Amino acid sequence: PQITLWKRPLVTIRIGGQLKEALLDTGADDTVLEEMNLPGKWKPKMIGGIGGFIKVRQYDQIPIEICGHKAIGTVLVGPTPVNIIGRNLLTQIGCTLNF
Amino acid sequence: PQITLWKRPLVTIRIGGQLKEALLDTGADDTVLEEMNLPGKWKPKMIGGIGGFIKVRQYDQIPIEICGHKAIGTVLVGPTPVNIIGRNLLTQIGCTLNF
Ligand SMILES: CC[C@H](C)CN(C[C@@H](O)[C@H](Cc1ccccc1)NC(=O)[C@@H](NC(C)=O)[C@@H](C)CC)S(=O)(=O)c1ccc2ncsc2c1
């Protein structure tokens, strides 16, 4: 699809057996999901945003389908106000910026 | 151009006659640049994301050339981690997300 940027580029994603709305975010190196109780091992991480840093749980090799396109990779989970699909997954679904 | 996402989508901008490197950030509502001088009146504003809010200076109707494309719009200036081109200007330059 083509997504214009008049509004937030929110799309439906499928992860760990939930459908979620998530921002396709070219400014995000990593994918950051709102708090959710994913199974499996994780590693602690701190990521820096506009207001400072938050602590997140890093889960590896998590399947995520982004409206139709399958990806698998690292997902960070923590107290973000929005689900963020970052470049690690955007590259996998062949997402580009175009102008 | 078409810009892939295996690297940060950093582009050269020209603003107030100065060249800077800024991140094309579809997850950002607004454009916020690191502390710098810009001509004209500004008003205090606060903007937020992960880690909470920061105080910025809002400059309206500021010309910025982004990767050779002209925009004129709101530029926020403050303690952002990186120079960010947000949707307010990405829309002006005709930027879309495609996959
Ligand atoms: C490169 C620095 C950048 C800040 C990283 N983040 C991604 C960014 O697009 C966020 C997304 C966002 C939107 C709304 C609420 C909260 C966040 N936008 C924002 O924080 C913007 N907020 C809004 C409301 O658009 C602000 C810029 C104000 C306009 S980020 O979200 O802080 C982020 C994401 C992934 C990641 N991986 C490693 S460090 C890292 C940091």
CA distance B90 to B87: 5
* Residue B61 three-state SS: strand
Q: Chain B: nearest CA to A91, how far in angstroms?
A: 6
CA distance B29 to B14: 20
DSSP codes of every residue in A16-71? TTEEEEEEE-TT-SSEEEES----S--EEEEEEETTEEEEEEEEEEEEEEETTEEE
CA distance A71 to A15: 10
Q: Locate tokens 């999901």: which residue?
A: A33
> Taking CB atoms and an 8 Å limit, are A69 and B1 in contact across chains?
no
Closest CA to A57 of A82, A31, A75: A75
> Taking CB atoms and an 8 Å limit, are B99 and A1 in contact across chains?
yes
C-beta B10 within 6 A of ligand 1 = no
Other Cβ atoms less than 10 A from the Cβ of A42: the count is: 15
* Residue B89 three-state SS: helix
Other Cβ atoms less than 10 A from the Cβ of B55: the count is: 11
Structure tokens that stand for A81 in this block: 């106000």
Q: For residue B82, what is the DSSP state?
A: S
* Residue A90 three-state SS: helix
> Taking CB atoms and an 8 Å limit, are B29 and A50 in contact across chains?
no
CA distance A11 to A63: 16
Of A50, A54, A84, the CB nearest to B81: A50
B25-49 per-residue burial string, b: 16 or more CB within 10 A, e: under 16: bbbbebbbbeeeeeeeebeebebeb
Q: With residue B90 as reference, give the H or E element that holds it.
A: helix B87-90
B56 in contact with A at a CB cutoff of 8 Å? no
Dihedral over Cα of A12, A13, A14, A20: its sign: negative
Q: What resolution in Å is listed for this PDB structure?
A: 1.6
Give the mutation candidate from B26, B46, B88, B89 for the A interface (greatest A CB count, under 10 A): B26
C-beta A79 within 6 A of ligand 1 = no
Report the nearest atom of ligand 1 relative to the CA of B76.
Answer: 29
Structure tokens that stand for A74 in this block: 């690292």
CA distance B32 to A48: 16
CATH architecture assigned to B1-99: Beta Barrel (2.40)
Q: C-alpha distances in angstroms, A65 versus A85, A86, B6, B56, B59?
A: 11, 13, 19, 36, 39
Q: For residue A80, what is the DSSP state?
A: -
What region does A18 belong to: left with phi over 0, alpha with psi -120 to 50, or beta?
A: beta
Q: With residue A89 as reference, give the H or E element that holds it.
A: helix A87-90
Contact B31, B75 (CB under 8 A): yes
Please tell me the experimental approach by which this structure was elucidated.
Answer: X-ray
CA distance A59 to B33: 32
Closest CA to A19 of A72, A55, A68, A61: A68
Structure tokens that stand for A47 in this block: 């990521």
